[PDB]
From Swiss-Prot, chains A, B, C, D:
GO biological process, one term: GMP catabolic process to guanine
Identification of the protein by name: Cytosolic purine 5'-nucleotidase
Gene behind this protein: NT5C2
Statement: the UniProt record of this protein carries the keyword Nucleotide-binding: yes
Residues that, per the record, bind dATP: R142, N152, Q435, R438
Tissue: Widely expressed.
Pfam families, per database record: 5_nucleotid
Length: 470, 470, 470, 470
């Protein structure tokens, strides 16, 4: 059972809007909105969205597998060996948020301070003592972006696995000689860094010049989660505030995806007339170029929605019904909707490009969608005894002042996959977990969970106290 | 009672090293080491220090007042009006960590997300609604370093007050006209930005080209806390590991200050022969140029300790007894002492230049000295009823779903000073508080508090859990 | 008669290698090599080439017209108005080397010091006094590359004309309102800057993603000058030194073009066996990325000449017969051929990317091919009386110490085209002329003119003397 | 006889303003203005000046010797060996415009293309073949400013000699070991680069924090050329246009120097009342910060001329009689004087900071003062037979197509000094010579030579023709 199976199962259910059913429903972890900092929903005057993996949740593992296949085919097309075609995407290997070390060709899972939690070279998981030869302090400087790439998005899941496939392949292929920083093939040397750049370039190519979008829109039922409760929630948001879309995707792709997401024989509720997707938004903005969007952005353009092309010129006019914007900046939203940052709840899946930057640069309120939580929540509750034992071993070890702690850690971790939970390895939290807590005011497996809370709900989190204040 | 009075009172006490007395002593908040992340002292192989406001704690308010006076005299010397000479330093006004907005000339106290907690123009404290005219989202982007300067160090305390004095003076002086971004005087316009740059330059000048150091060393009993337990703690650290100094100050000043700090008729304990301060250190490094020190640093030089001048050339040799280094980088320490980052406990007062950068860039373990805590702890415990009432009002307000919450907030805040606690305004934590929790593994009013813990103590902090994990 | 007609006429002639015929032939300006700084051909050990507009001289105006048409079609494809399709390339308008001012939308012809010689807005030529409203000092700062784009290459000829077509079109189209920095169309504003960026992007697109290369190689006799004396000259160079190619183009395109350039039923001379084009080169390098090539360049790769794709890895081996390189740097050439810079005569058409940078950054000897000189030489000799009169009027005016000087200037200039000679307006030299003299050691309408000089010819230029030295 | 002896000898002569005497006087090379590009003096509406080495010509070798001594004393003060005190400035060694190679510790004389003309390591002049070991192409990339420093100003003359003294000293001192890039002294390594940085820093220190200015103004008759014809020429300029000063020096130093330069018992002519120096200027600007001045500059300030300190605030008012400005930009001059660039003749000694930048960035007309020409002109005319022979040998060698050419070159060069003429080595022009021709419209040994030309003189230079145009 993948996380998108869970999401689709919940998506197939109709909305029972009886108040008692809602309060009962939101009590379950799977339909709950989790709270890092308190948020009074009554103060939210605008609800903003991105599209990919928020409104349009791509089904797993089918969509990752499609991206993987097209990326592999692109690398073979530009000269990588034919054996790449025998790879097959494996969803049990990658966890989101790993760091690829382009110097030594390792995938690393790290905590918020750069400490190594897991290190894998190809499919070989390197134990603590052996990692010290390359990482003397079992530590990396995350900000060295020339060396380290953080695979933070769900679009990065296929290349996370592909990097490991490639390192495994070249390590074990007799044509090549393994070296510390790459592979030697006579008079040719392929560094892990150039290999990584080829993979990155190929992933980009597949999304923007290849056939990924075409293959997606020709079979949207296979590739995109669909929920009849989406127009109900958006119609309810529009009753109490304004609603906007700000996506990096272009208008033609947005229109195809959004049309599918709203393709029901009804509108907000069963029995109601169908309405076009654009009617649910007070402001539609494509080609957003986030995260630059939250700084100076780009010039504001207007989409000719008949042709899908940009009109000639910078758009200088006002908000008009039916207009579609392109580029601009977050100040465009605030100006055209008459909003301040804390009036806005921005709902997205990119922990950096959506959530971190809108929080840090503009003081927007933030809702992080984490699709994998729809399944991680099931593992967490089902194996709570593993974690509880780990807590007790940690307390026992501290007051006593080992191999049992590592074994339980491994067993707990493997329930999530070969690279463990998105949020921790054993008792140690990941960088990703830390960023969620620090920058996502609210988070959930799906933003649909807002449907189960009344219009003026007060999301509450306990106040933080310093050690000397307790 | 200032925080340095508290520190000096504790410094005057002799060390009772009976184990039961120590454990009793460390139980009191004033002599406790507070723990943000767990740290096993047995794993620490090197203890590192800065000098200023860590080993050499400058007495308050005398030292700030000296800096203030010399800075004022410098501004008058370069052409500011004579009325500046009538200013007098007032320790009740500044709290450390405020942000000066060079655009509108305000001092701001902010939380970790840039939200305004306090706004003062000169000595006028601007209430919430009036702040929205200049801060529509009651929010600043901290990283806009061209506009905002964060007064993060104890050396910034005099200029924090001076900026407010100057804004007050020009606002109320009839020769000038107040404008949004500065002051008009006929054909001259002084922006808050250029005023701020003059103040910054004058503070720098006083420390490096003026008479501040000379005036300090000619009366060290007036200006520097002195503790006979300092050589005892350092001798104990040297029994179980290595000890190093890395200061931004030059050798001549370091030698004068450190000689005074060790000027007792005894060594580590009463009755023992006096030892020169250098003998307590395995590695002495001056002109450190932190925070650049934790990146590429500067070329490693050797101090001629006879003359106080640098020897000619880059030093290429090994660690030698009696050598004093200059410049270099944090890698110098690790190489010469055979240490890895997590082997090092680095003890400092600069939340950014010492603690943040050594943690983020090198994975060092960190101990933050917060001198003002020596007194903030007394206010916190004495007025705990104010805070407890505030907590209850917050809980009452949330479940009820105001003016009483603001009044209690003001009354609690004013016990610390006109700019409130270093760590909070009412129930809202400051940016400084957040950075302490995030980057200081341990913290205390003085590093001397390590004296009261056994050699292999395990400092413990509770594990963090995400909302969905609770 | 275009300059490529002249070049093709000379190209059709067979080589008479009798010494007396050669010396007679090189006496004519059209077959002469012109000399800015003395160069002893005996000291040249390597001859290097670019391909486009040096070996492969594209026929005029057919090739510019093709580029113009495809660029227009691309702009219409992305949303520019249909009326663009009625434009038709006009070779009499553009002169190479003009500056487009993106602020005011003017094409400018300037001297070496940025002084305005000609200013045209659309097709309106602005007289001196009217230019002062926008150019108060009749001067531009060339280095302000955010504002000014210098149309320095022959590939820039179509967009030079297109920019003027577009400014003319929008100025006179009733849908738009003309403003100082662009065109208003209700709520849309198109600045000259964004218009220029669209044109630049479309030209790039046509060359690298569009059909320009495909259309070129499907009719090479229409689009490319062909000269049976090319393999003769290259074979003669290989007798006395090494020969290399360094082109920005990719291998597949290079192979198609070079195969055509050598497609004769003979080799170096009539009667000799045909040889493949690669055999004429000791070193072949594609994807050169000049001018970055003359700095750090890019990593050295090897082309798989069977597939046209790059082999995997950085190439670390030696120079090998038959290998084709990709990327690298100018140091690659020097290392693999055992050359120093002054051993190299580098032959190219890009006054900046080829000639300036190889001279300034590496001290290479330089030969600049200027295709338009093949026709400018005919205008210069035929209308020498116009220029001679201008010289006399200048001398008369100086010793006398006007309208006649401007009229003669205009009449002389118009013989070259609407934008005058590449090298001057009247008696004032262009920036381009100055750069040729400063950075091209030798120059000619075609590098084929080297065929008419003996192996150890000494090209001589008179020494320069300062005013006080004369 | 130094060049300042020549200048002072001419300065002592009274002005005979009879028209026939003037025309006779300007015929002599020593009193002539030399012309690179034609300039109609009638079109000049503003005459601008710098102060140092233009209005205030420092006497040679006394002033260089003072700078040398203070720089040496500063290096010894910071820890260089005592033997430095035995150095003594030698004016016969340095020629202006040499390049110090911080990698290999050589002084280089180069032509405009970076070709090596002379190479000296310490006082050892390295012959051609031996230079190829470090300079394989006998070529340097001038723009590599991290490696090469061009000693372009007269203030650089002492450090030019000092760098050679130091390289000589350490090479031959037995305490040190000579290495390719510096000197080893056991565990200390002094690279030529760090040595050079010490020298540069010490020269800066002497000018701005040391006693150079104090020592200069306490004996101005020893250190500064004085000419009673200076106020006559400036009064004549003010009759036909405006006159401004723009100096990098501060007001207190400018006032002392300018007061001395005008300290005669008369004003413009003998018999006339003395006038204060400020009265000769329509605009006085100090702290100019050229060359940044010709870009965005700094904020415009006003000097309080009573105190010598800056008034508080940016100056926003108009040009007022008696006001003295500080900072600003070249646009300040143009705005306040109502000038365009080609209305301005800017007179200076810094070939880069004055002349190149005002020409390239603003299109100002330029007059370069070259003090050494006052003596180089005498060597040039007296040894014209050497140069004439060299020309003939060059022509003979070319048509013949050696050791005699090198011997004559050496003999000619040595008449100027150990580093030859500022303008050439033998028949090869220096970079400096090339920059003079390219950027100085007019040049002379002194700007006083303008006194000998009528108000509306037309300076004329022959037009430049390309090779194919001749």
């Amino acid at each position: 059972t993948s996380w998108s199976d869970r999401l689709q199962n919940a998506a197939d259910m109709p909305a029972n809007m009886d108040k008692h059913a809602l309060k009962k429903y939101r009590r379950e972890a799977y339909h709950r909105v989790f709270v890092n900092r308190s948020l009074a929903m009554e103060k939210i005057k605008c609800f903003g969205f991105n599209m990919d993996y928020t409104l349009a949740v791509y089904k797993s593992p089918e969509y990752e597998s499609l991206g993987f296949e097209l990326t592999v085919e692109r690398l073979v097309s530009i000269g990588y060996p034919q054996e790449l075609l025998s790879f097959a995407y494996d969803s049990t290997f990658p966890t989101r948020g790993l760091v690829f070390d382009t110097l030594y060709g390792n995938l690393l899972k790290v905590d918020a301070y750069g400490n190594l939690l897991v290190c894998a070279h190809g499919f070989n998981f390197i134990r603590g003592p052996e990692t010290r030869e390359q990482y003397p302090n079992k530590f990396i400087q995350r900000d060295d972006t020339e060396r380290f790439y953080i695979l933070n998005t769900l679009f990065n899941l296929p290349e996370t696995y592909l990097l490991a496939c490639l390192v495994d392949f070249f390590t074990n292929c007799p044509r090549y000689t393994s070296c510390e920083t790459g592979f030697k093939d006579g008079d040719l040397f392929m560094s892990y860094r150039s290999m990584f750049q080829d993979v990155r370039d190929a992933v980009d190519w597949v999304h923007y010049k290849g056939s990924l979008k075409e293959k997606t829109v020709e079979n949207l039922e296979k590739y995109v989660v669909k929920d009849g409760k989406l127009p109900l929630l958006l119609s309810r948001m529009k009753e109490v505030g304004k609603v906007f879309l700000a996506t990096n995707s272009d208008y033609k792709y947005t229109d195809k995806i959004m049309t599918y997401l709203f393709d029901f024989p009804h509108g907000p509720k069963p029995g109601s007339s169908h309405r076009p997707w654009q009617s649910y938004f007070d402001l539609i903005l494509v080609d957003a170029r986030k995260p630059l969007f939250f700084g100076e952005g780009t010039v504001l353009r207007q989409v000719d929605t008949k042709t899908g092309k940009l009109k000639i010129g910078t758009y200088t006019g006002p908000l008009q019904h039916g207009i579609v914007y392109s580029g601009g900046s977050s100040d465009t939203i605030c100006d055209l909707l008459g909003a301040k940052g804390k009036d806005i709840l921005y709902i997205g899946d990119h922990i950096f490009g959506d959530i971190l930057k809108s929080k840090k640069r503009q003081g927007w309120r933030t809702f992080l969608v984490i699709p994998e939580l729809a399944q991680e929540l099931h593992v967490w509750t089902d194996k709570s005894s593993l974690f509880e034992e780990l807590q007790s071993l940690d307390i026992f070890l501290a007051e006593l002042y080992q191999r049992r702690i590592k074994k339980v850690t491994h067993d707990m971790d493997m329930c999530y996959g070969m690279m463990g939970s998105l949020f921790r390895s054993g008792s140690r939290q990941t960088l990703f977990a830390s960023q969620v807590m620090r920058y996502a005011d609210l988070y959930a497996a799906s933003f649909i969970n807002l449907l189960y809370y009344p219009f003026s709900y007060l999301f509450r989190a306990a106040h933080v106290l310093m050690p000397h204040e307790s």
